[PDB]
Nucleic acid binder design. Structure first.
Ligand code: MG
Ligand code: MG
Ligand code: MG
Ligand code: MG
Lengths: 147, 97, 205
RNA sequence: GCAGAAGGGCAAAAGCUCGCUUGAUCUUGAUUUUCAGUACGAAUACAGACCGUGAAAGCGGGGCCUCACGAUCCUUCUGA
RNA sequence: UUUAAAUGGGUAAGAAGCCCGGCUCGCUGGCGUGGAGCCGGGGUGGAAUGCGAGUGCCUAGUGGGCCACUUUUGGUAAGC
RNA sequence: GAAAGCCGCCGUGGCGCAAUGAAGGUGAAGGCCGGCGCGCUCGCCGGCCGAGGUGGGAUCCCGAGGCCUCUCCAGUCCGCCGAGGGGCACCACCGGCCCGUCUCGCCCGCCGCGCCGGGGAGGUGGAGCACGAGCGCACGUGUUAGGACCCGAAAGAUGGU
RNA sequence: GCCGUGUCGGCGGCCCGGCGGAUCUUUCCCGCCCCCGGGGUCGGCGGGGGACCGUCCCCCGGACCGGCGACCGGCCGCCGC
RNA sequence: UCAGUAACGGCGAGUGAACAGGGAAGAGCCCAGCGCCGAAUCCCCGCCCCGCGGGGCGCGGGACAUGUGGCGUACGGAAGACCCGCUCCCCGGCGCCGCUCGUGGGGGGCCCAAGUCCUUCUGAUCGAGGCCCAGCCCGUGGACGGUGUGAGGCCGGUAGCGGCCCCCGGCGCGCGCCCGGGUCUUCCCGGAGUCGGGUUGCUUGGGAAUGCAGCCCAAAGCGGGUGGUAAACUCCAUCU
């Protein structure tokens, strides 16, 4: 849509929206990120603080699969299975707690996030946080580990 | 009680025992080849760096002798295996006489 | 050249990039080309199935992916040896062979051996002029179709277990906690150090 | 007179002499000055230690106050 | 510089205010002391004049100025 | 028709759904009720619930009273309604939680009693949490990299005549 | 005649019904592991079965409106012939 | 996709790969060496079996070649001897018949229906008309050319339309070639101025040097290479 844009409405005026005085030339401030310490310094602090310098340890050839663990916290914990389970879970049949393994749902670690409901569970994950296991051990549930 | 981190790591599976792949038995001595290389170190002799090496290894010391083989042959791990096979020439020349 | 709050950017256009551009205008013209490279290959072969030989059950590497099942390259010698078929006869049966693959588990060894005997019992061969060694009568009553599609025995079939329902017992709601992670995580890293202090009290006399 | 350039300030003193000392130490923030309301510098009021001096309340984290100084990257030494 | 204008600067002109009852505290301390904090209740009309305000985003141009009252600095003076 | 349609055990993947630390790593729910341990500046067990509180807060709810051809007896309604109530978004404040550090401290745990693990209480650092709002497509504006709104050098390099 | 929405029932068509469900059934059925030729549910594995729940397909009642879903009868008032 | 990410960089401007994962396509093999078989092998010439469009296995001479041609063998192991239960094969050439999935290729020449009636005009392809069968054709209303705008006047286009000529991939008579597999026992088992180390240039994201190259030094055989921070010790992995 070249129809709806600014240069049709700006055609007939001499300086084309760039000034009689400044008169937009080519590169008045330098090309790219030029002047990042020197004359554009006020811009690089106050909008990009931290941008210049070493901060850490160098780690040659990291592989983004060894540090891979997705997390499911306890609020989202019941949507991994059917809603047909937990309504079937509490119907006076004993303490028969259903399994929820997050590893066949594609998650490795179970974190904490409050309001885990009143039913007992067994939760199969590779990792846990200690807030998360004491929510599960508070509703009478169990917390079974897998490699 | 299996777990992912620790000293007993990983999903516990059972080992398949088997005779190893044949290419891994690659630099064995294969006594016929031991015969060929030992037949040829008496028709041919020793290199000039390693005749100078065994004339430090009999008298001068060994620590200056290994530092000499450290320099000519490359690494440290090649310099000790060369040194202890020169000391076994120097044992078979002297102590079997 | 910068302005108010925005992104600091590194476009990599400082190199002569208009010469090495690849525009995909032939990409429908090639998708209808390599369909014809499959159709005029599938009728070119035989009633032999399309999409090539049978591939193994293979589990992926690299912890992110080690929970799933992939189709591999070839069954290999160890798995061909137990199934009973010869290592060079196997690729005219329709079975691919990858001799550089190793078996170090026994569960996944028997999985592909069960896979490979299951294949041969649902395979029908054609003798040239009908002598038929290790083959019987009329060819499975004309073999119920002609040619298969995109994998013989559905090679991924990533399957999971049922594990229906248990009752939360004692020693299970008591023990296996976060603390067993953190202690086992510490015992792996203080393992070599503590075996060094153990040598120090052995040289203590 | 208070080290000095000036102004402010100052009398059982902030001056002079003497007596004990090392707060010229350790640590987190807040605030002011320049200001874009950024930094460095310098300064203020605290708080948490450990100490000094004094009979004591107190006073003291340099100079009576206003100047006395310096980023990234690099090197160096220190600290668990 | 003892004295000291005119013009000027900051603040205040109520309900976020005023009064009363009780309770927390590890801060403070002869002390039901001190000071904050919280909860409960009781009474709205609080100089003149004028006006509807509050807020958040994206943002171009600009970064050579020039003159006049009056006040002023350098210059003999200047359309300086 | 170089289109369109379909796939879902083609969702692999991308961005989002979780932050923080250089890193090892860790990783976001509290309030009440009843009792007890020296109800000890500290806490423990059980139940109730369930994103804390304060001040403003559109809107909505309640509303004494008020308004109608003759006087007491009843109905729907509507308009006015002082006062009162539950309070969206959002703003200010106070409190809480997660990660890094810092000070002070005490207790607990056991695939093994240790130059082991876990917890506390106050203060600070963070682009966090405090019942999710992103993703895809399109258009607009602005910034940038590109020949970059058009035209312009004095130069420089390679290879030749 | 008619279809919409909640209530169901005849578990009717579930074995001559569709789909969906990380519901359930170690007594079903097939190729196997764990001990003394056989055996023990003796704990499972690969596959198939059939119950249950979730939703969509007919029969009898009942509920409302018969809503732009309609035709027949009868009424009114128009119209053209 | 990973990813503008790990990393490089007056750590400035800038630069910047890979491995898993999803797909396209998928196919594997051979020698030197170690031994074994009386060189069992190849080239060239000469006349012939007998031939088309010329290549040979068959015959006799000259060379190559033991300083090593050919056979069985290659790291997934191999060979020989046992013992054990199977088995008679494949390849090309020649004739000819039967098909070829868009229905094998190439080339030629063909295949619908108005020029009807009125009318305009320089000339029509315009404009109006064809019974209740819709004037005609349609698997043909792409196009172009014809005195102007054409489904029907003409090339054509439609059609697993027809007929012609040549060329091609594959069934069956005559040549040529032809013992595999398992178990055990014994024996065999590998590529050097190369790897590597030093230093010096270049290059790379490759950083205590990723790659390459010069010069110097120069290996081993339970060895060697790799395992992304230089080194010594050790264990394990992986490759050859
Ligand atoms: Mg204008
Ligand atoms: Mg403009
Ligand atoms: Mg400008
Ligand atoms: Mg030049």
């Amino acid at each position: 849509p070249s129809r709806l844009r600014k240069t049709r409405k700006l055609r007939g005026h001499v300086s084309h929206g760039h000034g009689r005085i400044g008169k937009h030339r080519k590169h008045p401030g330098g090309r790219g990120n030029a002047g990042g310490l020197h004359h554009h310094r006020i811009n690089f602090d106050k909008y990009h603080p931290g941008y210049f310098g070493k901060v850490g340890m160098k780690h040659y050839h990291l592989k983004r699969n060894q540090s891979f663990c997705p997390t499911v916290n306890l609020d989202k914990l019941w949507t991994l299975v059917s809603e047909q389970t937990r309504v079937n879970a509490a119907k006076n049949k004993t303490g028969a707690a259903p399994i929820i393994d997050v590893v066949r749902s594609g998650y490795y670690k179970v974190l904490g996030k409050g309001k885990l409901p009143k039913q007992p569970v067994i939760v199969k994950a590779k990792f846990f946080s200690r807030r998360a296991e004491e929510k599960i051990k508070s509703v009478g549930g169990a917390c079974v580990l897998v490699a | 009680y299996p777990m992912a981190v620790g000293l007993n790591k990983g999903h516990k599976v059972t080992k398949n025992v088997s005779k190893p792949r044949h290419s891994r038995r690659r630099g064995r001595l294969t006594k016929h080849t031991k015969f060929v290389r030992d037949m040829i170190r008496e028709v041919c002799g020793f290199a000039p760096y390693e005749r100078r090496a065994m004339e430090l290894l009999k008298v001068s010391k060994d620590k200056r002798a290994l530092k000499f083989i450290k320099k000519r042959v490359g690494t440290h791990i090649r310099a000790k295996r060369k040194r202890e096979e020169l000391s076994n020439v120097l044992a078979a020349m002297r102590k079997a006489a | 050249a910068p302005s108010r709050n925005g992104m600091v950017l590194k476009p990599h256009f400082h190199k002569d990039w208009q010469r090495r551009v690849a525009t995909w205008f032939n990409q429908p013209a090639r998708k209808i080309r390599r369909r014809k490279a499959r159709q005029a290959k599938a009728r070119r072969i035989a009633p032999r199935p399309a999409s090539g030989p049978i591939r193994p059950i293979v589990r992926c590497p690299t912890v992110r992916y080690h929970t799933k099942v992939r189709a591999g390259r070839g069954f290999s010698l160890e798995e061909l040896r137990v199934a009973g078929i010869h290592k060079k006869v196997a690729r005219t049966i329709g079975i691919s062979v990858d001799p550089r693959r190793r078996n170090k588990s026994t569960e996944s060894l028997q999985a592909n051996v069960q896979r490979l005997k299951e294949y041969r019992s649902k395979l029908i061969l054609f003798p040239r002029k009908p002598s038929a060694p290790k083959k019987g009568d009329s060819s499975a009553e004309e073999l119920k179709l002609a040619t298969q599609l995109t994998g013989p025995v559905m090679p991924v079939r990533n399957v999971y277990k049922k594990e229906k329902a248990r009752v939360i017992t004692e020693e299970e709601k008591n023990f296996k906690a976060f603390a067993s992670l953190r202690m086992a995580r510490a015992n792996a890293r203080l393992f070599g150090i503590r075996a060094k202090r153990a040598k120090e009290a052995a040289e203590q006399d």
